Design a protein around this ligand. Structure first.
Ligand SMILES: CCCCCCCCCCCCCC(=O)O
Ligand SMILES: CCCCCCCCCCCCCC(=O)O
Ligand SMILES: CCCCCCCCCCCCCC(=O)O
Ligand SMILES: CCCCCCCCCCCCCC(=O)O
Ligand SMILES: CCCCCCCCCCCCCC(=O)O
Ligand SMILES: CCCCCCCCCCCCCC(=O)O
Ligand SMILES: CCCCCCCCCCCCCC(=O)O
Ligand SMILES: CCCCCCCCCCCCCC(=O)O
Ligand SMILES: CCCCCCCCCCCCCC(=O)O
Ligand SMILES: CCCCCCCCCCCCCC(=O)O
Ligand SMILES: [Co+2]
Ligand SMILES: [Co+2]
Ligand SMILES: [Co+2]
Ligand SMILES: [Co+2]
Length: 584
């Protein structure tokens, strides 16, 4: 509907709850150093003003744009120059430039102390006694630490956090219930943040064409019944939405997503049969629902790709008159028939086909030259499939924890220069990827692995390039995204590496380990295993196994011993000397 007041407009569309939550997020992301109660006050002022406008749109300042009003509120902050320095100078600018000014002065890494997780009982009491304040303080705390995380997506995590507390605080064992859930949500939060940045970094580092190629592949998988023309229309729209979201303006990004959501829901008949329930959903949820929609089933009578792309005599002619449209159609056709492939695999095939057409269409006899291009696809398809069966079989033999340890040893041996915390975190996450994706049937394993492997390898690459230690990791991280995982898969053992000198404190343990959680204990042991491998990198899988066995016995025994701490000391020096002798 037409509206005199934009803020009254947004308010009625979102509802009061979502509005108040998003305003809090927006303020926390722009003013990261201001305390909670000042933010609560601002939220309440903006919210009370919104409701003035809902009641009377002819009221003072209700006609103003939400950008103008938002900037106006920031500029009423007293300590703005004293706290944010030159951000105060934004206030001397007219509104087109002012929001741009403010947006540039967001601090990606604010110097804020790590957010500590309270005990389960204190959280549950806080949740019980003061639900609104509990949940909003933390929304504030997370938003100010993540100024670029898309606010509506953060709102969606907050609701799952709320759900976890509702269930687990009434449980018999609260901590056994709650802490796994909070660990999952944190992982998904770190993953969502990873993807968002990775989209923008891909788009800038590699450009639209490659971005669109990725999108063609994925949308053809999701929507195999759609005609190429429609897919291409969605890709073009999807590419522009990303472009404007990567600039970081919330309203712009939200409006764009909701336009694309609106388009897709009006054209369900031309896109997918799986959009129905998504398209009934309210504003913020609809775009989010559509992003996570499941693959539609493929049409029945699908011709072979050979006809248009190998056997036609007009392959070169059709290619030459529009190369990207032709390659787009190739990718569209291949992808829609193969939801079981990774997008990157599909892009490798499309790039192979491109390379082949480029040379073969310049040969005296093209039709001959390019007649067996589909043979080049066999190894490309094989390579990821092999690793899947190979890792998921090993996962089934060992279980998550020991699978993780198998990885620790493998990757420490390959890149021993990486810091111990990084190797532990990456190997654990890689372990979970196996734990999650290996449970799927074959058809679903490769897309699963690609998605989760993408965020884990992003997190590694992000960590690494802030503190570089290995050129080989650098090369894998700075390569094309299509080649990133194969580059990492190709890393060999570093036979050059000179062992880390012995540090007795690293391999001394204490009685505290017995009472720690399964998670925390595993981490202390995994830390030690990395260091063991770094100190003895020529140790055989079987030699380490013997040390790992003796260590298990050491823990088990000293955790039943009366005097725990002298056990750990006395037996500990024994295990260490024996191990040193063993691994010589
Ligand atoms: C989107 C966030 C909304 C509210 C979140 C409430 C959760 C608070 C408990 C976790 C605090 C420490 C962070 C963590 O390790 O999980
Ligand atoms: C520890 C806070 C977890 C909150 C999860 C919601 C999404 C926020 C983005 C990523 C949060 C954790 C990032 C970090 O470890 O610094
Ligand atoms: C290039 C600066 C504007 C950033 C645009 C925001 C959208 C991307 C969200 C990424 C959040 C993670 C933070 C980071 O990795 O820098
Ligand atoms: C709604 C987003 C779908 C279209 C994605 C655009 C192409 C960018 C691909 C590069 C980033 C990969 C991250 C991921 O696996 O999600
Ligand atoms: C950086 C490599 C990205 C993948 C390259 C695949 C090449 C074949 C696809 C050509 C681009 C199609 C773009 C489109 O029409 O949407
Ligand atoms: C884009 C810069 C200013 C953003 C903050 C404006 C103040 C209201 C925020 C909440 C309402 C809009 C949220 C949305 O539609 O996604
Ligand atoms: C696979 C179907 C595509 C439809 C998704 C529409 C939403 C556009 C994505 C824009 C990304 C903004 C950042 C984010 O929400 O993570
Ligand atoms: C580290 C164990 C993860 C569990 C699954 C193994 C993944 C191996 C295949 C990787 C495929 C990703 C997509 C691709 O590069 O084509
Ligand atoms: C510091 C750790 C770097 C090494 C870990 C990255 C490698 C994981 C990607 C591939 C995992 C499944 C297939 C494979 O292991 O080749
Ligand atoms: C050569 C230096 C002395 C080594 C002392 C033993 C430390 C290695 C134990 C860590 C691995 C145990 C993990 C497990 O399988 O539970
Ligand atoms: Co309207
Ligand atoms: Co009660
Ligand atoms: Co625009
Ligand atoms: Co080198």
């Amino acid at each position: 509907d037409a509206h005199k007041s934009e803020v009254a407009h947004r308010f009625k569309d979102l509802g009061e709850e979502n509005f108040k939550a998003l305003v809090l997020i927006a303020f926390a992301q722009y003013l990261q150093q201001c305390p909670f109660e000042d933010h609560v006050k601002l939220v309440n002022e903006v919210t009370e003003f919104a409701k003035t406008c809902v009641a009377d749109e002819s009221a003072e300042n209700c006609d103003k744009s939400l950008h103008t009003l938002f900037g106006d509120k920031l500029c009423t902050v007293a300590t703005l120059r004293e706290t944010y320095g030159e951000m105060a100078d934004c206030c001397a600018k007219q509104e087109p430039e002012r929001n741009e000014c403010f947006l540039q002065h967001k601090d990606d890494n604010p110097n804020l102390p790590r957010l500590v997780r309270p005990e389960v009982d204190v959280m549950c009491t806080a949740f019980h006694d003061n639900e609104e304040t509990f949940l909003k303080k933390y929304l504030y705390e997370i938003a100010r630490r993540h100024p670029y995380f898309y606010a509506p997506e953060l709102l969606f995590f907050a609701k799952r956090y709320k759900a976890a507390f509702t269930e687990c605080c009434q449980a018999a064992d609260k901590a056994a219930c709650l802490l796994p859930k909070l660990d999952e949500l944190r992982d998904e939060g770190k993953a969502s943040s990873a993807k968002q940045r990775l989209k923008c970094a891909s788009l800038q580092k590699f450009g639209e064409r490659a971005f669109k190629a990725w999108a063609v592949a994925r949308l053809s998988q999701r929507f195999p019944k759609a005609e190429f023309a429609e897919v291409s229309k969605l890709v073009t729209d999807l590419t522009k939405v990303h472009t404007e979201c990567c600039h970081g303006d919330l309203l712009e990004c939200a409006d764009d997503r909701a336009d694309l959501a609106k388009y897709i829901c009006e054209n369900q008949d031309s896109i997918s049969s799986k959009l129905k329930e998504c398209c009934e959903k309210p504003l913020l949820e609809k775009s989010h629902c559509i992003a996570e929609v499941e693959n539609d089933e493929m049409p029945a009578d699908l011709p072979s790709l050979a006809a248009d792309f190998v056997e036609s005599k007009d392959v070169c002619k059709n290619y030459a008159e529009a190369k990207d449209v032709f390659l787009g159609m190739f990718l569209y056709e291949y992808a829609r028939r193969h939801p079981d492939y990774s997008v990157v695999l599909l892009l490798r095939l499309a790039k192979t086909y491109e390379t082949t057409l480029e040379k073969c269409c310049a040969a005296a006899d093209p039709h001959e030259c390019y007649a067996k291009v589909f043979d080049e696809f066999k190894p490309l398809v094989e390579e990821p499939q092999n690793l899947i069966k190979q890792n998921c079989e090993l996962f089934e033999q060992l279980g998550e924890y020991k699978f993780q340890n198998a990885l620790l040893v493998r990757y420490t041996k390959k890149v021993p220069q990486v810091s111990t915390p990084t190797l532990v975190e990456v190997s654990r996450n890689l372990g979970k990827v196996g734990s999650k994706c290996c449970k799927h049937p074959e058809a679903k394993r490769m897309p699963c692995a690609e998605d989760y492997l993408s965020v884990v390898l992003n997190q590694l690459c992000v960590l690494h390039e802030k503190t570089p230690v290995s050129d080989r990791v650098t090369k894998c991280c700075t390569e094309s995204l299509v080649n990133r995982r194969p580059c990492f898969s190709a890393l060999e053992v570093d036979e050059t590496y000179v062992p880390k000198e012995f540090n007795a404190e690293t391999f001394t343990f204490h009685a505290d380990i017995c009472t720690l959680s399964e998670k925390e204990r595993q981490i202390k042991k995994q830390t030690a295993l990395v260091e063991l491998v770094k100190h003895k990198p020529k140790a055989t899988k079987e030699q380490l196994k013997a040390v790992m066995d003796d260590f298990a016995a050491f823990v088990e025994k000293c955790c039943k011993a009366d005097d725990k701490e002298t056990c750990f000391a006395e037996e500990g020096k024994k295990l260490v000397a024996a191990s040193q002798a063993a691994l010589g």
